[PDB]
Design an enzyme around this catalytic site. Structure first.
Site, PDB file in Angstrom:
ATOM      1  N   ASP A 123       0.882  -1.208   0.000  1.00 48.12           N
ATOM      2  CA  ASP A 123       0.000   0.000   0.000  1.00 48.12           C
ATOM      3  C   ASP A 123       0.916   1.254   0.000  1.00 48.12           C
ATOM      4  O   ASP A 123       1.461   1.629   1.058  1.00 48.12           O
ATOM      5  CB  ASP A 123      -0.958   0.021   1.235  1.00 48.12           C
ATOM      6  CG  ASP A 123      -2.111  -1.013   1.162  1.00 48.12           C
ATOM      7  OD1 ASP A 123      -2.046  -1.992   0.387  1.00 48.12           O
ATOM      8  OD2 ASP A 123      -3.092  -0.844   1.937  1.00 48.12           O
ATOM      9  N   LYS A 180      -6.957   3.509  -2.951  1.00 57.01           N
ATOM     10  CA  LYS A 180      -7.343   3.459  -1.525  1.00 57.01           C
ATOM     11  C   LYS A 180      -7.582   4.893  -1.012  1.00 57.01           C
ATOM     12  O   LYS A 180      -6.888   5.820  -1.435  1.00 57.01           O
ATOM     13  CB  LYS A 180      -6.228   2.727  -0.727  1.00 57.01           C
ATOM     14  CG  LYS A 180      -6.326   2.759   0.819  1.00 57.01           C
ATOM     15  CD  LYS A 180      -5.230   1.860   1.484  1.00 57.01           C
ATOM     16  CE  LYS A 180      -5.110   2.151   3.000  1.00 57.01           C
ATOM     17  NZ  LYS A 180      -3.973   1.429   3.659  1.00 57.01           N
ATOM     18  N   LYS A 238     -10.407   0.289  -2.297  1.00 56.59           N
ATOM     19  CA  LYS A 238     -10.305   0.009  -0.836  1.00 56.59           C
ATOM     20  C   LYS A 238     -10.689   1.243   0.014  1.00 56.59           C
ATOM     21  O   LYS A 238     -10.100   2.330  -0.144  1.00 56.59           O
ATOM     22  CB  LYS A 238      -8.880  -0.482  -0.465  1.00 56.59           C
ATOM     23  CG  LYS A 238      -8.630  -0.684   1.058  1.00 56.59           C
ATOM     24  CD  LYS A 238      -7.275  -1.324   1.366  1.00 56.59           C
ATOM     25  CE  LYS A 238      -6.984  -1.313   2.871  1.00 56.59           C
ATOM     26  NZ  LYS A 238      -5.588  -1.774   3.192  1.00 56.59           N
TER      27      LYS A 238
END
Length: 253
Positions: free
Chosen positions: A123, A185, A217
């Site tokens: 991430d 995300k 996400k």
């Protein structure tokens, strides 16, 4: 894609905006099966103060409940990989976290070390100040370099939506997807408010219009089963949280 100058990126992005339905439709997708909610949660501990014993407890909880992955900082990847041998639980490492303004060379060094240590997912934080300045070739090259250094990872790119307009969110989704990201995300949880139904619905609308396979996400402030359900209805396919144990316990009653 690699050929484009900043003006050419601006024209491409404006063209993608022109295809969207306004006002943006909200809560388009079906509810999740609540009894199986653990399978879509990344179980997270990123506090600077977190000890080795606290990381051991995080890993034990993930093995017990069956969370998708644990999410940790670079210096705890090796410990977590050892703890979870023989299970179906992956390890997600954060990259350029939380600021996003670390050089491309530093982000690449971190990505290579994490994969060598056994991580399955990364991430990374976008250089979102460049995004606001319309330094589009710099944003694109930063993501491409990480993507090529870690070809076998599931790669997620954090936008930090608290710092962006809707026009900037559209640009960030387009650049991330065309560079090869598997997910976009919402938030770090370290700089401003987290996931909203409005921002998740917009991110989903942009990704679904493109030819690439990029998913969404939702992260930051997800504390209850009700929060999980609403973010999935908005288009999320993975959730970031620290409260997963309390959330699953709710569902069993």
């Amino acid at each position: 894609m690699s050929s484009l100058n900043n003006e050419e990126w601006d024209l491409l992005i404006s063209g993608k905006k022109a295809t969207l339905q306004y006002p943006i439709p909200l809560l388009c997708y079906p509810a999740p099966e609540v009894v199986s909610i653990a399978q879509i949660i990344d179980h997270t501990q990123l506090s600077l103060s977190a000890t080795g014993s606290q990381i051991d407890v995080l890993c034990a909880e993930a093995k017990e409940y069956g969370f998708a992955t644990v999410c940790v900082r670079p210096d705890y990847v090796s410990r977590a990989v050892q703890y979870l041998q023989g299970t179906q639980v992956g390890v997600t490492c954060v990259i350029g976290f939380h600021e996003g303004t670390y050089s491309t060379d530093q982000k690449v060094s971190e990505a290579k070390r994490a994969m060598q240590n056994g991580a399955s997912e990364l991430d990374m934080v976008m250089n979102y100040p460049w995004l606001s300045e319309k330094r589009y070739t710099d944003v694109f090259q930063d993501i491409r370099a990480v993507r090529l250094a870690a070809k076998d990872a599931i790669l997620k790119v954090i936008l930090e939506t608290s710092q962006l307009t809707a026009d900037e969110i559209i640009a960030g989704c387009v650049l991330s997807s065309l560079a090869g990201a598997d997910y976009v995300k919402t938030s770090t949880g370290f700089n401003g408010p987290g996931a909203s139904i409005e921002n998740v619905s917009l991110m989903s609308a942009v990704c679904d219009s493109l030819q690439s396979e990029t998913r969404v996400k939702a992260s930051g402030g997800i504390r209850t089963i009700e929060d999980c359900v609403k973010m999935v209805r908005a288009g999320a396919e993975r959730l970031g949280a620290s409260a997963g144990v309390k959330i699953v316990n709710e569902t069993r009653l």
